[PDB]
């Protein structure tokens, strides 16, 4: 499913993402935009370490979800990577919350540092009614 900007912002709000671990809704929106273009079926294979990023938040198979084919794979969030390819984002949200419980927080995603950190991200939620 490819989400429309405001539709996604309200859905994240409803799932308790606004301010989770000090992270504003605007920042999660900035992250989803750059990671997947708000697309839940987005997958990215990393040839180098043989891991794959899955879903709207591009969650990595080496540490957070299990796909069976990732070398040296671990499971912190404990889900099947398949759960992160659904139209319903509840599991993807549960996984993203787990990722930011680590001290790095939202900095865990390099794309967040490149295009979201220390920038005005209001544009991602303006006019959405959140």
UniProtKB/Swiss-Prot annotation:
What organism does the record attribute this protein to? Homo sapiens (Human)
- Name the PANTHER family for this protein: LYSOZYME C
| Entry protein name | Lysozyme C
Q: What gene name does this entry carry?
A: LYZ
Which Pfam family, any one, appears in the UniProt record?
Lys
Tell me the active site. Answer: 35, 53
Q: Which SMART domains match?
A: LYZ1
One GO MF annotation is:
lysozyme activity
* Disulphide-bonded residues: 6-128, 30-116, 65-81, 77-95
**Top enzyme class:** hydrolase
Q: What does this protein do?
A: Lysozymes have primarily a bacteriolytic function; those in tissues and body fluids are associated with the monocyte-macrophage system and enhance the activity of immunoagents.
